Symmetry: C2
Subunit: 131 residues, 2 copies
Amino acid sequence: MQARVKWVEGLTFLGESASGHQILMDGNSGDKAPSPMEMVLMAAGGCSAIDVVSILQKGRQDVVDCEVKLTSERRERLFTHINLHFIVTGRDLKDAAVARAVDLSAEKYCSVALMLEKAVNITHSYEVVAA
Amino acid sequence: MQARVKWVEGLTFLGESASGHQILMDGNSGDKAPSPMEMVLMAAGGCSAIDVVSILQKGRQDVVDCEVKLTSERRERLFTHINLHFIVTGRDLKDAAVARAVDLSAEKYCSVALMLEKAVNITHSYEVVAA
């Protein structure tokens, strides 16, 4: 539970996780480091990609790479919509398995996704590339 | 809108912001870098602290330091509750001004806070230290 953030200077803040790591947020439109809102977008991408690769490895599917293209829109400033586009690379991965993994990840397993869903329109999509 | 995440190895993912910066997320309980859920907690702290220090500087208040103690609980895994505790340091800052700033920040200006609120119980609190 012990996370903290500290004002460094300007609008730069230091962020310390309870897993013992530190990061930097920059409130000048992410000038020198990501803005908090960028943190959120990336965390959604990351949490999702984690679960997607996990499901495939458990299902013995030979997943070799995973990339997430994130797009979003926001009020002129809350996010109105985030799209997670998965690019899954592997050997014999079947469509049904990738759909399952992207599905369960985005709507059942990804905490970040599920928290945002109650306030943001979150959509997903995927493609499969041979290695 | 152009953020992305890339699988590096293990459960380590690279995250790239459209402001042109990169970070690392680690899905092994934030082993080597923060977990996505830690990203979210810190972004809420950061977005909040940003707005808090901004309001005070606009109101000509001599804010010298700002720290946020974050605590949270989560299902045994969504966050059920996040508490933002602000520690504002300054010279002649008045209580009414700090309350205002923490208030507007947490319930009107902080996008990250406001997105989470629809799914998580978010509470705030503050204290004021002389410099």
